[PDB]
């Protein structure tokens, strides 16, 4: 069976799945925030000694927003890493995170990979890229959507692979682990009139012992079912649950928690972790709403927190095979 | 006796003292940096319970670069606070600090004041201003040079006083403590063609039990002798010791350690603390050189580390009165 294999107008990419048409969060007080969204020191600060591996995956650490660190099958990789305060081309305006990054880039050791779902300042953060590339160099491989190679090259990144969807590659030392850029329903833009000059997508990571899915930003299309059927079952999937209100505007580009759980099903993962949410105010929902709505969905679909969990900032979770 | 009381061309301010004419730092490796310039958690993180006061001053915490937290005579105040990574109007270019700020703005409680010496991205940091103002509001009074009021107002700061030199004011609750804007030899610029639209200076803080001096960025002029004589003796002075090489270009605007110790003498402080240095690479000296040269100066002038000390990032020091 074939898949959404996309896809251009004569210039930019469009989504092509037909669920696409081209059509009050309120935090404050340092005490309440710490109460509701505490920031934990990741394990690797006081126990830098080992992780990943061991021997059959799989460990994840939520570093906020859509940044997760994943340890499996002898690799540690990083998704959409944003360690800066502001997701913006400007110092002066644009969204400031209200929970600090749980660690600095000087802690970590990504061997040998990062995964970028789309450009977009809250996923592709120049200062984070620079810092990562200053620290590791060649020794870090960047997997990015078709059309971003150049941008990364100009940041000084030399070990970069650019992918159309359903295209696949690995990290040179570790050929047993396939990285596949898979579809998603979203968009790209960093400047004026660059709309969708670069692809957006999800990542399916296929190792000998484990399989991990990273949704990126989306919502809700076939494709998740295509992915679920082509790869899958997956062991863990990271799926956004924030930035969804108001529905009439956001639904084409952002799942709500209900739709998040439909992706969880469609993709055939044993478990999922909530990302996006709780970090930047990018839409109108009360900053604590997404986890509440997640649980309402789970209850409705006959599932459980065990199946689709939300971490604290900086928390880790081990998933035994 | 009178003082350099300055001073304009017909537009911008100029220095007017005649020591003014209008004419390789190499860090790296996380391990070495932590070895040479460790970053300490300030006391107020695990012991937020009391400071300052007690009862007769004075406590200081070095937060990096020219940002110092000072506790005396029932106030806590903050100088040139920069808690961001990059001193720049851009995200994309401009100097990145190589030692992280030792704390976030969410730790602290400045009652009720910040002191700005000059505009200039490594001393006036927008994101730090916004964050401070978001946290405290009206409760925090900002003392700034003549010409900066509006800029601050547009940041949303509502409790702001602007001062020419030798002008004085206090924090409303605490009238026993006088803040005086005093001269310095430096310059101002944030954009194109705004050179010296806003004054630059130092701050003399006069309390019932203590007196503190903050040099700002400068190099070496009379004025420090004017300040030493008008106010003074001082209990503590914070004085820059980095950003001085190459001398032929920088000496009109930045003291070297040697000149730092001349300021220490001129200003008649019992003690001084090194600031500027060790945080951003703003000039050409080896990042560790300033402290070495400071000690060579101290030795030459018959003084001691006890007289003019350097802190680690985030370290505090208490100075008991007498
Ligand atoms: C002339 C003056 C021009 C002034 C413009 C100043 C712009 C500064 C603020 C930029 C806003 C950053 C937005 C953060 C971001 O990337 O996320 C918003 C959006 C995607 O976020 P997502 O998680 O998908 O949620 C969807 C929310 N609707 O992501 C995006 O929309 C992409 C950002 C589009 C705006 C980029 C504009 C750059 C302009 C530079 C021009 C300079 C000319 C000289
Ligand atoms: C057209 C393109 C224009 C491109 C310009 C991009 C500039 C980005 C880098 C800015 C550099 C930041 C410098 C950091 C800083 O404030 O300190 C340097 C100097 C004072 O530092 P100090 O401790 O006194 O040491 C002296 C060093 N000689 O401080 C200074 O000199 C003040 C900074 C002057 C540069 C400001 C330029 C702003 C330009 C915005 C124009 C936009 C037009 C559209
Ligand atoms: C240069 C000043 C800052 C001066 C200061 O800090 O005192 C800043 C403040 C606001 C900044 C502008 C914000 C809007 C635009 C943002 C774009 O992404 C780049 C160009 C513009 C036009 C920016 C140009 C420049 O970055 C400005 C004008
Ligand atoms: C920073 C200068 C003005 C500085 C001055 O008055 O000297 C002003 C003048 C024009 C200003 C822009 C006008 C259009 C926009 C209006 C928005 O509400 C905020 C962002 C923008 C992009 C503004 C950003 C910034 O506030 C600018 C660039
Ligand atoms: C301007 C500096 C170079 C400064 C120097 O020469 O020292 C360079 C170095 C890296 C450059 C960026 C690389 C990533 C991007 C490449 C894009 O096609 C244009 C925008 C960006 C964001 C570039 C903007 C700018 O051109 C930067 C920041
Ligand atoms: C105005 C210069 C002309 C180049 C030059 O001066 O040599 C052009 C060249 C490329 C243009 C910038 C590069 C980044 C973006 C390219 C976008 O597609 C339009 C917005 C931006 C931010 C552009 C704004 C500006 O118009 C630039 C800088
Ligand atoms: C908007 C892109 C960033 C695009 C990206 O991050 O991918 C950035 C990259 C370099 C940026 C330019 C750097 C030089 C200038 C800095 C000034 O202080 C404000 C205007 C200029 C002209 C900036 C405009 C804008 O801020 C640019 C063009
Ligand atoms: C970011 C655009 C180009 C993006 C593109 O080609 O599409 C480029 C085009 C012109 C570039 C500027 C040219 C003059 C400067 C050259 C310096 O060595 C780095 C800073 C400046 C200020 C550059 C900053 C930035 O690198 C710009 C604005
Ligand atoms: C200031 C930082 C680095 C300072 C540091 O981290 O130590 C660097 C990064 C990019 C550099 C700027 C790029 C644009 C300009 C390049 C020209 O040749 C003249 C110097 C300028 C104005 C540079 C000023 C300074 O050399 C910058 C801003
Ligand atoms: C552009 C935003 C407003 C955004 C909004 O309307 O939400 C405003 C809010 C505060 C503004 C800044 C206040 C300090 C400065 C005032 C100067 O005279 C022009 C440059 C600065 C740096 C301003 C640039 C810009 O005009 C800002 C950043
Ligand atoms: C003179 C002002 C800045 C004065 C300041 O605020 O420091 C600067 C700002 C931008 C500078 C221009 C950049 C574009 C041109 C580049 C050429 O290589 C020299 C001539 C030009 C026309 C430059 C002339 C002069 O060097 C300018 C206009
Ligand atoms: C080009 C606009 C015109 C205002 C408008 O468009 O509404 C003007 C208004 C004020 C100007 C900016 C405000 C901040 C700075 C003012 C400086 O003296 C020159 C450089 C800057 C960064 C200016 C660049 C730019 O040229 C601006 C934004
Ligand atoms: C280096 C390019 C010129 C490239 C060219 O001529 O084609 C020019 C264009 C704009 C120039 C900058 C204008 C703003 C600053 C003004 C200062 O008074 C000198 C340092 C800076 C940062 C200038 C240094 C540098 O010379 C720039 C970036
Ligand atoms: Zn996003
Ligand atoms: Zn997005
Ligand atoms: Zn300075
Ligand atoms: Zn300065």
Curated annotation (Swiss-Prot), chain B:
Positions with a binding annotation for Zn(2+) 1: 118, 120, 186, 217
Free-text activity regulation comment from the record: Activated by divalent cations. Activated by bile acids and their conjugates, except for lithocholic acid which is rather inhibitory. Binding of deoxycholic acid favors the selective release of anandamide and likely other unsatured long FAEs. Inhibited by phosphatidylethanolamines.
Chain positions recorded as deoxycholate binding sites: 189, 193, 281
Effect of mutating residue 322 to N: Almost no change in activity
Location relative to the cell: Golgi apparatus membrane; Early endosome membrane; Nucleus envelope; Nucleus, Nucleoplasm
Cofactor binding comment, as recorded: Binds 2 zinc divalent cations per subunit.
Major location category of this protein: Golgi
Domain of life: Eukaryota
GO cellular component, one term: extracellular exosome
An individual GO BP term: N-acylethanolamine metabolic process
Effect recorded for residue 91 to S: Impairs homodimerization resulting in loss of activity
GO terms of molecular function: bile acid binding; identical protein binding; N-acylphosphatidylethanolamine-specific phospholipase D activity; zinc ion binding
Keyword tags: Acetylation, Endosome, Golgi apparatus, Hydrolase, Lipid degradation, Lipid metabolism, Membrane, Metal-binding, Nucleus, Phospholipid degradation, Phospholipid metabolism, Zinc
Tissue expr: Widely expressed. Highest expression in brain, kidney and testis (at protein level). Expressed in adipose tissue (at protein level).
EC numbers on record: 3.1.4.54
Coiled coil: none
Required cofactor(s): Zn(2+)
Subunit structure as annotated in this protein's UniProt entry: Homodimer. Bile acids promote the assembly of inactive monomers into an active dimer and enable catalysis.
Similarity comment text for this entry: Belongs to the NAPE-PLD family.
Function in brief: D-type phospholipase that hydrolyzes N-acyl-phosphatidylethanolamines (NAPEs) to produce bioactive N-acylethanolamines/fatty acid ethanolamides (NAEs/FAEs) and phosphatidic acid. Cleaves the terminal phosphodiester bond of diacyl- and alkenylacyl-NAPEs, primarily playing a role in the generation of long-chain saturated and monounsaturated NAEs in the brain. May control NAPE homeostasis in dopaminergic neuron membranes and regulate neuron survival, partly through RAC1 activation.
Name assigned to this protein: N-acyl-phosphatidylethanolamine-hydrolyzing phospholipase D
Organism of origin: Homo sapiens (Human)
Gene giving rise to this polypeptide: NAPEPLD
Residues of the full protein shown: 57 to 389 of 393
